[PDB]
Structures are given as structure tokens and as C-alpha cells.
């Protein structure tokens, strides 16, 4: 059974950065795509990085294109979103979720809250 | 111009019978989109994979009271006998390359109620 544990959230102030994690198990993480998705308050579900099963390619929307990085340690079995000049706009749960063939999201971890306060 | 437009949120009595729409944009009338379900408090998550000829293949634990089918830029998720546990938002999302960049659309949502 697939588990995703996010980790590294909290309070935070806008201009600031943080760096969040998250714990797989259940599965062989460098057979996989990894991904972060964020819900912000609104509830509206908003995708934000991809990264390749040995970490060779990333993408992003232009959204956080210059400001969040994708990273994994597959010997860990930890995926990681590195956020920097953190925005009000940054507030939401983020999420990481994992693939599967075709689909995207086919797994999702439990979320880790982010608030910028300004 | 890629954008999903979703059915109004509405309330369904238990046994009932639910049929929610995605409607992608015009342009990408063919496109397969991905259904997602949030209860209450939890993680979203993946319903079923619904494409151009309504074709599908759902998630695990989706019972078979979820089915999809499509008309033209519509992409529709019926709920059979509406259970309690079926009290969630439902969200499709579309992927994309664009301009040899990955692009990913959610929709606004519909809340089902019961």
C-alpha cells in the first residue's frame, strides 16, 4: 500500500522561504513520477512541480517557475519543494502526489499546511 | 485557452441518482481528463481517467456506481445510488504540453451534497 507523508509546513511571513518534505513508502519511489499540487484557501486545486523518476527533468507553471524548485533523494524516498520569496498567493495545503502511467495525480499524501501572513 | 468549466454544486437524496459535467474549451473538446473526489477534511482522490468517446478506467476503491461517459466537449461523472461517503467536491483536471511545457488544468469543483 502507497504512502505519502508531507512534512515542513507552518507559519510563515511573505519574502521569507521554506522547505518542505515528503515520506514515501509503500512502493519503489525511483520507478515514479513525483509531483506537488497545492489547494488554497478557496479551495480551488492548483498544480505546481513535476519532477522525473531519477530527478532528470522538472517542470513548473509560471506561477512558481522561478521561485519553488523540485528535488528528490531517491535513496531517501523523500520528495522536496524548496519555496523562496514566499507570496501571500503561496498560502494553501500543498500536497505531493505520485503517478501512474498516464495518470498524474494517482496518489496523493495527506498535505502539510502553508500560511503566509500578510 | 485551455479551461474546465464545471456543473453547478447540487444536493442528492441517498439512492438517488448524479450526473456532474466538465466542459473542456472548445479547442481541446478531445482531451481525456481525470476526475477527483475530496471529502470533507481529506485528500483529494483519483476517481477516473474519462476520454473523448467516454471510454474510462476509475481508480482503486471506486465503486461501480461511478461511471463517466462523454458528448462533444463534455465530460460527465454519474454517481449511482447515492451514498453517504459520496458527499465530496469533485474536481477534473486536464493535462497538456503546450509549448514543450507540461501545463495542468483543475476546475473549480461541484460539491455534492446529500
Known amino acids: 500500500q502507497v504512502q505519502l507523508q508531507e512534512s515542513g509546513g507552518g507559519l510563515v511571513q511573505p519574502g521569507g522561504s521554506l522547505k518542505l518534505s515528503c515520506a514515501a513508502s509503500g512502493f519503489t519511489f525511483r520507478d515514479y513520477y513525483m509531483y506537488w499540487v497545492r489547494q488554497t484557501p478557496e479551495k480551488r486545486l492548483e498544480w505546481v512541480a513535476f519532477?522525473?523518476?531519477?530527478?532528470?527533468?522538472?517542470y513548473y507553471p509560471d506561477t512558481v517557475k522561478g521561485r519553488f524548485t523540485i528535488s528528490r533523494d531517491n535513496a531517501k524516498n523523500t520528495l522536496y519543494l524548496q519555496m523562496s520569496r514566499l507570496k501571500s498567493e503561496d498560502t494553501a495545503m500543498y500536497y505531493c502526489?505520485?503517478?501512474?502511467?498516464?495518470?498524474?495525480?494517482?496518489?496523493w499524501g495527506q498535505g502539510t499546511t502553508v500560511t503566509v501572513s500578510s | 485557452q485551455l479551461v474546465l468549466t464545471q456543473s453547478s454544486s447540487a444536493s442528492f437524496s441517498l439512492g438517488a441518482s448524479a450526473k456532474l459535467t466538465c466542459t473542456l474549451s472548445?479547442?481541446?473538446?478531445?482531451?481525456?481528463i481525470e476526475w477527483y473526489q475530496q471529502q470533507p477534511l481529506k485528500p483529494p482522490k483519483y476517481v477516473m481517467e474519462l476520454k473523448k468517446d467516454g471510454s474510462h478506467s476509475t481508480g482503486d476503491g471506486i465503486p461501480d456506481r461511478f461511471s463517466g461517459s462523454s458528448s462533444g466537449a463534455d465530460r460527465y461523472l454519474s454517481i449511482s445510488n447515492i451514498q453517504p461517503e459520496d458527499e465530496a467536491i469533485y474536481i477534473c483536471?486536464?493535462?497538456?504540453?503546450?509549448?514543450?511545457?507540461?501545463?495542468?488544468?483543475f476546475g473549480g469543483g461541484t460539491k455534492v451534497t446529500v
Open positions: 502526489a505520485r503517478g501512474r502511467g498516464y495518470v498524474w495525480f494517482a496518489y
Open positions: 483536471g486536464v493535462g497538456d504540453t503546450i509549448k514543450e511545457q507540461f501545463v495542468y488544468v
Open positions: 472548445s479547442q481541446h473538446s478531445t482531451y481525456t
Open positions: 519532477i522525473s523518476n531519477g530527478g532528470g527533468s522538472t
